[PDB]
């Protein structure tokens, strides 16, 4: 048993080591995919970040001016490495770095600080009062140095310098660098309307640079606010909320006041009182234009409503022009209500595009990064959410309390420390499963192909019957595949950790995962090999099934919410799905920085995944187990269409796992018996055999005979178990077949009609392999093999492989294989076919040696051989037995008579018969009676014929005693432009007829990829339906167990004592434990006292409040340092049992802070204005009077002091709003009257967006790009696996030599190639139509646009045009028509993916430096491959469609040269040049009797000779021995020549050289004066070829072949039918004329071959053994047609191995030994020259004594078991015949024959010289 495994692994290694040009690429193919992801590793360094702090965002409650300067200042939210001054505990200004604040400080220091300034102001006021009453300069002079120092201040100096380009000439660069100047002067950082308004709007939207900013700013400026609960309380809230709007209205009315003044200033300047002392023009235009601009702005934004639906329908219309800011809805405070509830809540309806998604609170997968992109991360602030919430909350607070509580609000993000920030993980998470699953599509396909092919060409079944069970071969295949794949993964093992792909994970567990996946893959291979039984089909539908098995992995990527751990496991029964889940968990562990190192196994990577890597491993191993069980079941239930009979599925329910026939003589133990057996083929309808009843015995060498196609191979293969019998007894001696299958398959040799052998194996190894399956060790086989080598004669080719041997050598090797070992039941079939008699007699001697205890059923067609060996002959005619018994009984019961075998331009055939009848009343045979002999008249006639040998011209004769050939013959009786058009139409109809009869191989290699992409598209259609975003309540305890804190800064103020004490204790921290009904799920809790457990300095204290909070005590320290250092420690500590890395920091409120406020004190400026008005007397204006009234309120709302800073983290998507609301509630509760309990008064906010069927334009767009990207390589796979199916027919035509036989006809290579190309492009154009039909049916909007549909159709058609002439050269390289398909499909798919995905990664979703240019370089370089032109074009079309629909959503050419124009108009040239390359590679880079013959051939020669040879030679490379050498024979027309010789001499070699297959090494072959080295198109016009190996399409009938070659020979289309009928009636091919070529017997096949050779009537016919494997009575018809052609005068050359056929036809002879001729004369010349005397044979010791006593001159030649042969000359044959007939009973002679130097004897005498 283990010895069998050792032998099988030995032979597998032996065959593999001969192919170390394909094993290596099989081993290293998966590693070839990982070349892009080493360059991505090297080109994506981990760009580490630096810790940077955030600016303090302002808020409208902090003051209108601070809010505006903030929104203009921190537009980009630039984080700063150093901490900001506003992050200190007490500073909330953070703006003195600006030059405006600096010059204001300089003004406040130089003036209004020294007492001199106050004295000057008082003196000026007194002087003004005195002048007013009337209607010193020393202090003014003393003020001159002060102002001189003021104007010379460096702050003012740089201010004056930078204000030089202050909008000179209307603006130096408009809105290009003026923003920079404004930032310098206000944002000092260390890095229905007027037609004028409409015109400005249209001008600004015209500019695309300013159009993007004018998308959200317009709702912010001229938007509208809708409030549905129009309550009086709501209205007073809004009156307390529009305070900043009122301030803006006042400041807008201020600029309108320059109309009451107008020219009053100019009146003073021109004609006032005391104008004589004794600009305005340049500034007034600016004032008026900014007045107009402020007039254009809309300031009334609140609009009432009553219904939510009305609010939504108005908001939609407003946002159509971007005029809807936000919608505020209060669930409480109904319009009929007018009071303030103690607890008030509102829900802010908003657009989805300007709010974050409510269904999710954070990123699903944690990563590094502060999440601080100003345009998308901070969607609340620039979207107008935080401002609106602040305004409404300030309104409600001022409406509730009456202390007005002036406290500003600022926000400040917690800074992030330095991290890695690698971009490789983003592409890794989306591409790694693909590259890890596509690396396993080539090896599985190759293994499936190898197994199915081995099952196909008769390799598993030929050894299964010998000694091997299916378990043995199955486990050897399993172990071999496991070893190879283990080597593959071991090469893959140390490739990524040393490739720097991973750095933390242990590279040992993934090795186990890879071996589990290897087991899964080999089990899949076993299953798939059991599924198929055809080479082409299995090669085709191999990777498609695997890839569509990987397909549903994308579904879980789409459905990230539906999938659970149980749901993951449920569909994890597929190996690729479990593999992909393992891959994604590995990248999840790697992205966290921990990786899988013997610790993360059994642990979920992200929150409640509840799925383990060990769980995936368990799923994979159980998948392998169930797959193996199913494979075993299917193998033992469905072996396939051909092979062992199929057991039924009930094998597991059982507990156990008339007078012409001779009677049986005694001593005949029945070994094999088959009675009443009938076999029927379903398509034919006529049974092959009907009523077989045989009695084979234990040791008799019984010969099986019958005409070709009767029952022979069927009957001799039905008892070896490889063909299912259709009822019939098969009992072989108590061990019945189909029951004792194992017992009968122990001692049984077998050789089929054809040859079965291992291609990559030598003779010696082939013998040793089968010399050890019977328990024999190495020693027995080694001692045994040499005897077989020396007996079979195959000792000169011991180590000469197996594929260089001809048919006879293969037959000899097969019979030697069946001979070795002990096999009682050998079933040798047809050992004598195309073999020389010299080896045939050796075969006979070997067979009679092994007949003592063996049953032999040897079958043949040489009746002489059967008579010599077979002691019992059974003949089967038309599938039924006709006669049986010993040959003596057969000739007794079927006539016993003598035959005259005289041979015969000389010949009369008119008087020889007359004189013969007078005595006894070129193959003339005369029947003579064996008995009633006169014994003297016969001798008299013999003497007369001897005397009349030459004059009659017969020249030869012989006498035989009843040969079996006559018995067989007796019993077989009763049983031009039009020419090219014709060529192309004939080839087209031939290909069409071939294809229509291959249905299962048409709709499986063509439309299967269409079904694949259809399934992929349908799966991509299935998507999670849109759901409206829920009403998200906003309270910080959503996360639970948070890490808050506070600062208690600036405790001096009594209000600051009031606050930061009611916040900490009573209502928890926000609204939890609020003494009423709110969020009942969260418990109130109990307080925990202070704690100071034992980064920076010391750990500050903390306290656990009643709510789930651990607020800290960072009150007196630097908050920034501790808050930025605790978070790394926090996330490090969070790794304990929480591998999802959840954080606890979520906010923080730092009380205290102050800013410098201008101490105008209100009425001081009003007094200044009144003074200037009463002095200048230019005042007076209703606008002036109404605007000079609210100055104290204007200044009060302008600024606010004593503010708070609200810290926040940014990972949470709602931290800002939640903690801002918490701080606002704390402020409101703090400043409250000391009358009510400050616990039952709070505010809760909800940020539910509008209930609109619209999603965020940042994931659906990415979702659409992904869904067009997941269906972007499926189409590549489909259109990469289609063109490979067109090379199978080409390579199978090349291998079986059918294409060359077509080239023998008058067909130019170009016409054949263009017909093939036209058929391919017509055939290809059923895939493009199908895929575009699927596209239009699914309405793929990326391509179903009418503008792009013709573009897509043209792209597909051109891709098909330029893809066909690329696989044409492959047919000239491969040899097996299933490895070429796999290799080509894999290579095409690999280049397609590695051309498309690289550009997709490099250009989209990535902006590279110094390699982005390389992307353009390769795009200009990679266009040569049509696959790149297809994939890149398709993805670019999809991307362009995405961009167009994005711009259409914002509000808004396929034939382009750079889009598809360069793709299309530079691919047709590629197609035509590749076709020209195909044509180029098609045309290029592809002793005595003979002494007089050679001299006459050279130096002139006969002018009428047809194919005069000249010194033909040939030596195969690597052999150092010429196959043929120096051949020169001239043939006259009308002469039938004979090329006889030993097997392997080179007859086939010479024919294939002279027919144009093999190039001539040296010499010339002058065919009618035309050299073969010259053009052979005209040489092909006068030839007909019948090769030794059949070359025909098995899916056609003979009549189709005849029509095809009649069209190809130039025959007009009206005589085709009549000449076809003439040919079929002259060759007898009429019963099977209209039958398929696949179901043809060997004799039938050769008959068809010679029939197709003779068509067209050329003056030359070439035959390469037309009679090998041909039954008698079929030779005679060939002889008749050949002699008809000869008497027609056209020369014919014939070769054979039967001696009778040549002497019947062939005139001249040429014995070829080792490629060297030995004779040239005709039959009688050789018989007279070579050999002497007469040859007499006898068939039964005393006979030898009689012969030596009567005949002095004789030789005991050919001494065998039961026959004798001699060369007695004597004087005349009459005396020898007389003495033989005298001693008939004395010698016990059974069979005798007398002749004179037969050609077989001289043949074996020539053959024995070696
Ligand atoms: C509160 O803690 C922060 C540390 O996070 C202290 O801020 C640090 O202050 C120094 C002052 O020199 C900053 O230095 C910077 O140097 C560059 C280069 O000369 C200069 O251009 C900057 O203007 C600045 O002076 C430093 O960046 C900053 N932060 C760091 C990283 O230490 C702050 O002083 C602490 N407050 C206390 C305890 O007073
Ligand atoms: C909150 O304050 C803003 C800013 O002051 C208010 O907007 C302005 O309010 C006034 C007073 O209602 C509006 O004036 C009215 O204009 C119409 C149109 O000519 C006129 O017929 C009335 O006699 C009155 O003068 C003004 O249009 C409006 N906005 C502008 C463009 O200045 C706002 O109304 C206040 N919101 C609340 C909560 O009521
Ligand atoms: N798969 C098949 N379907 C239909 N007919 C078949 C099939 N295989 C063989 N046959 C025919 O069944 C008959 C079998 O007769 P048989 O004498 O066994 O032929 P053979 O031995 O295979 N060739 P030969 O030695 O020349 O007679 C022939 O007519 C075959 O052509
Ligand atoms: N590709 C090959 N390389 C090397 N030797 C080969 C090759 N093909 C065949 N041979 C051998 O070289 C000789 C070629 O002569 P071949 O034409 O086979 O002889 P043959 O007498 O015509 N044989 P056959 O027609 O089958 O009876 C034989 O000995 C072949 O076995
Ligand atoms: C002015 O800005 C600098 C910048 O760091 C700061 O240190 C300083 O405290 C500021 N002074 C005032 C008065 O705001
Ligand atoms: Mg046969
Ligand atoms: Mg040959």
Swiss-Prot record:
Effect noted on mutating residue 1779 to P: In STGD1; uncertain significance
Result when mutating residue 1071 to K: In STGD1; uncertain significance
Consequence of changing residue 1394 to D: In STGD1; likely pathogenic; decreases basal and N-Ret-PE-stimulated ATPase activity; reduces N-all-trans-retinylidenephosphatidylethanolamine binding; does not affect solubility; does not affect location in cytoplasmic vesicle
Pfam family, one: ABC_tran
Annotated consequence of substituting residue 1602 to R: In STGD1; uncertain significance
Outcome after substituting residue 12 to K: In STGD1; uncertain significance
Name of the molecule in the record: Retinal-specific phospholipid-transporting ATPase ABCA4
Organism: Homo sapiens
Organism phylogeny: Eukaryota, Metazoa, Chordata, Craniata, Vertebrata
Gene transcribed to yield this protein: ABCA4
